[PDB]
Structure formats: structure tokens, C-alpha cells
Amino acid sequence: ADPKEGVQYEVLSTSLENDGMAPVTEVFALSCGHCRNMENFLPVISQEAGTDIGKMHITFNQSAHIASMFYYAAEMQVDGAPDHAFMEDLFAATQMGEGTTLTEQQEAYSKAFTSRGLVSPYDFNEEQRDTLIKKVDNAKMLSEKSGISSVPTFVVNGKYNVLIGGHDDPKQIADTIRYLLEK
Ligand SMILES: [Mg+2]
Numbered sequence: 001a002d003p004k005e006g007v008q009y010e011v012l013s014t015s016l017e018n019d020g021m022a023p024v025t026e027v028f029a030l031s032c033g034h035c036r037n038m039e040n041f042l043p044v045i046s047q048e049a050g051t052d053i054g055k056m057h058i059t060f061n062q063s064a065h066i067a068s069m070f071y072y073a074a075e076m077q078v079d080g081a082p083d084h085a086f087m088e089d090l091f092a093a094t095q096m097g098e099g100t101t102l103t104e105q106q107e108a109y110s111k112a113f114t115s116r117g118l119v120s121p122y123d124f125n126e127e128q129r130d131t132l133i134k135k136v137d138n139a140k141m142l143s144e145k146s147g148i149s150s151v152p153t154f155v156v157n158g159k160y161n162v163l164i165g166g167h168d169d170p171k172q173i174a175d176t177i178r179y180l181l182e183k
Pocket residue numbers: 075076077078079080081082
């Protein structure tokens with residue numbers, strides 16, 4: 001019944017213990033349908049693990065740096081990470097798919113901000129741009145340092161990565177998180 005190394009979690013080869021991530025961090029990508037659908041189970045996992053869950057946006061290619069820019073632009077204007085409804089708008093914009101232009105995508109991104117009274121990144125001022133660059137660059141560092149390939153996933157105290165393939169449901173993910181926190 002104890003979670004086991006190599007099955008329901010692994011020890012990251014390069015620890016991020018001291019790099020300031022939330023004790024429980026969901027590593028995700030706005031382009032990933034799986035991460036989009038996982039949003040729906042985050043309330044249950046957060047409740048059974050008994051802690052809030054932070055977010056880190058990973059990047060696997062250049063195209064993804066645009067997604068990461070929109071995400072950190074959202075994150076920096078709200079308390080904590082963007083809520084599940086703001087997250088849905090950003091997922092939806094990123095995954096518009098093949099018959100959509102880069103322009104239609106950009107207007108969906110932009111709407112997510114303005115419709116909640118926030119500033120769209122194109123309209124940022126000098127100060128905001130400076131804050132955004134620092135956030136994206138930190139994400140980029142932490143991503144590359146972690147070596148993570150597979151999202152969504154959950155990192156606990158910057159040192160263990162939960163293997164979601166090793167769990168049958170969200171309760172079991174939450175239980176592994178708790179076990180790792182309870183070391
Ligand atoms: Mg915030």
C-alpha cells in the first residue's frame with residue numbers, strides 16, 4: 001500500500017528542493033489535452049492531499065514559449081495560479097487546432113485577459129514586461145533542470161516526481177503526494 005519508487009514516483013536526478021517551487025507543483029503545458037482534462041480533477045487531488053497545488057508551465061519547443069508567455073502573464077496578475085475557469089480559456093486558446101489561424105488563436109488569448117479586467121501581454125508596460133521575462137526565464141530554467149518529459153505530472157518538494165501512469169485514479173495520486181509530503 002506504500003507508494004514505491006519507480007512505480008508511483010521517482011526521485012528527480014537533479015533535485016529542485018531549493019529552487020522555490022510550491023511544495024506540490026503541477027507541471028503542465030497549455031498545448032496538452034491531458035493537462036486540460038486533469039484541471040477537472042485538481043479539486044479532488046488538492047483536497048485528499050491536503051494542500052494547495054502550484055503550477056509550472058514546461059516548454060518542449062519554441063512554439064511553446066508563446067504559451068508559456070500567456071500563462072505567466074495570467075499568473076502574475078492573480079493571487080496564486082489562475083483559477084480553473086481562467087485555465088480553461090487559456091487551454092482552449094492554445095488547442096484551437098489545425099483549421100485555425102495564428103491570428104484567431106491570438107484573439108482568443110487576448111479575450112481571456114480583457115474579459116476578466118486584466119491586461120493582455122501585448123499591452124504590458126515596461127515594468128510588467130520585466131516581471132514577465134523573469135517568470136518565463138525561471139520556468140525555463142526549472143524545466144530544463146528537472147529533465148521532465150511527461151505532463152501532466154506532480155512534483156513534491158522539488159525532489160520527487162509522481163508517475164501518474166502508476167495510479168488508477170486521482171485519489172491514489174493524492175495519496176502518493178501525501179506520503180511524499182509526510183517524509
Ligand atoms: Mg499569481
